[PDB]
Amino acid sequence: QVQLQQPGTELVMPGASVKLSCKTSGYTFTHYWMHWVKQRPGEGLEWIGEIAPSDNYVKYNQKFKGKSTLSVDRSSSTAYMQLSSLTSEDSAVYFCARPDNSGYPVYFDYWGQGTSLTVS
Amino acid sequence: YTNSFTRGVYYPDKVFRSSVLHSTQDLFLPFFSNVTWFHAIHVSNGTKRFDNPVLPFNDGVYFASTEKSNIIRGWIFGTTLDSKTQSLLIVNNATNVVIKVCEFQFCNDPFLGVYYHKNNKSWMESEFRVYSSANNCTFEYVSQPFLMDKNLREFVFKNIDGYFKIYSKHTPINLVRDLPQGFSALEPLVDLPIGINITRFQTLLALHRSYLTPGDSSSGWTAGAAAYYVGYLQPRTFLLKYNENGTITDAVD
Amino acid sequence: VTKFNGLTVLPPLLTDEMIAQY
Amino acid sequence: DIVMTQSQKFMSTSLGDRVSISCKASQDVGTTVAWYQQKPGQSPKLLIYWASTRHTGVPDRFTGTGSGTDYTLTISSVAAEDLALYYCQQHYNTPYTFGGGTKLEI
């Protein structure tokens, strides 16, 4: 069955860099893109960006450009999203999502477990 | 029938070599091997004698012609010559060569109807009678017509790894009945990624309007020059001699 | 009397004009 | 870009009753609106991906209605499992924006 596993309960210090992992299984990684969604209690859910596996095409949301860096590893079918220059506002819970199609539009048919990032 | 004395050798690859002797193992027409010589159409009485056998296409076929009227018009390639399986067509007409790979339901005796325009004093094709219909058409190719324009037109047809490779060479000759003795390598013409396995082939003939008449005697057209030679390629080892320019001057079987 | 693929050919110590002098 | 606004943040409903969740669109997005449900400490699950066609597995209780700029998520009978957080998402074009969320309660 399709699973998108994330560690969670991430704990970092402001100004550092974190590499959030989204392990995928039960489905072909190369045939679909990868998306990330950030969840803040006061701002709800916001889409971060899209990364195409085995490709150099990357698209970030304008607000999160530079803040988040999207990395993909074809081996082990793992998706990564690097956050640099972390502040207190970045303290939130991040969701990795499996797109229904490798393109746009997309409605995020599947979701990951999510990593709860805390910046302290 | 007619021995092919050092004929049918083509450039095996696009490699350039200068003043060296390259020993290559590839499908070749063996030296001094008799090649069947066919009279496609013979007219006496004026009775029309039609003979267009579908020779089996095994490995490669060395095809030659000595027709100054360009009666030979093209080729047929098909494993079954039926709409059930895809077949390859090579058709030469005024503007261009027509190459179509498709499921073709051929007629019993395919040919091309061509008529003479009195006003323009030229011959142009009237109608095409080769196939009833075409289905599941896959590959189509067009190029500048080469067979047009007393001379020997040698064509070697090969189908290896799904690639239909055709080699051509034109040489003016002074012989009538048999292939002139002498060596001329066959340059590649075009390679086709057809990807179909073929076991039979047949030759297109353009038929004049007088020949199409129901009368058994046709007095408006002559097909005495409709003579084409066919040889079968076999796996062989050849010692090819490349000159300084890069052409094949001599070869040893 | 009448090649670089990892091979090399070293010139002889005595050049052909020089052995002619001997 | 296009923004999704769920007007009501916390709303109350009784078990077994019929409820409707409202989502507003700033532009005419046709019928490209998706709904998700999120339980506490759980991943969101797709419920109805375009306007009315439900996702695989979800019960018939969830029914997505609406067209144009007005879109509604309806539940025929509210169960204990339905007391969660719900979002509305537009997929008219990139960038992607979700709703402000709405939590069901007794």
Next chain:
Amino acid sequence: CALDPLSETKCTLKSFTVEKGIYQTSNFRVQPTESIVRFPNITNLCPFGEVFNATRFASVYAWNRKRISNCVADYSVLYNSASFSTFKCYGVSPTKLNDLCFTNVYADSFVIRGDEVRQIAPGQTGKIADYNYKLPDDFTGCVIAWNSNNLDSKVGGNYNYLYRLFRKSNLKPFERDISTEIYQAGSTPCNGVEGFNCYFPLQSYGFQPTNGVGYQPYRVVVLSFELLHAPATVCGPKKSTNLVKNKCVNFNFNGLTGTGVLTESNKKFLPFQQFGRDIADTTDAVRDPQTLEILDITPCSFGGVSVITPGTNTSNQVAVLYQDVNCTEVYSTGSNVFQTRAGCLIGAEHVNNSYECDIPIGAGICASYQT
């Protein structure tokens, strides 16, 4: 060992007092400076202008199929263009399409409204999917849709396009149904005329600018990527880098994949021939695909370091011999560089006066330690 050539000689001989002579210490290999890939001009471009903004489109039930093959297709350029509102690729990423190769591709051009855009996708059930056009579940392709409100909507109404409301059975994937037979919804057979239980399957589209975006017309082109275990007739355009001569570079001339220093050559290839070869079956010349010029390939220079030293008892300075390498084309250079047939030795200054041979070098050249 790496301090100086005399120390390298000491390490190679594994001693501290090296005697007068010549010692091959290591090999000088010239690394490639860069890599160049050259490919022929993009020729016979696919007619994608039609699938972009053709003058007219066919109805969804009689969807038009266009064969695209024997050309170069820039799917990345298609993706960059923002005219397409909907660009869904369920099978594979659009960007990989430019790198990937397909033996044939078909474009399905049809007009459906925005709300019916969803029905054309794998895993979806709808009236357009059931009776107009169906997509295989495992189908690999891209669905392209963009707004056609200005083109296919009129104030009076565009009823030219037709869609099938109902049919006896669902259409199979990639099946085109143009049949105008009146549908039978009852036991009584249809007589070719409108009846209570007989209704015409096709329905005229309702397109108006005042209608909503979902109701507004959209022109949809579906690209189908098919592999028949055969060589690809159509492929993405290949990258070409500017040619560099007289510098040892990695080169890829239509798949030669060799390393050497390229040079313009006077040898004349046959027009069909592409790359030459020498006696020993090694590539020696290649023709530039972009411009039909014949380029020789000599390999990158290599040799032996071959330190020239006198006895360590006598001196501590040495001379480095770079055999079969000319220093101009390439101890550091610039210190009495002397070039001879055996090589281009560094550190010894040439003298015209001739003495007896002391340290052999090659081609009659002998080194010595003298004022």
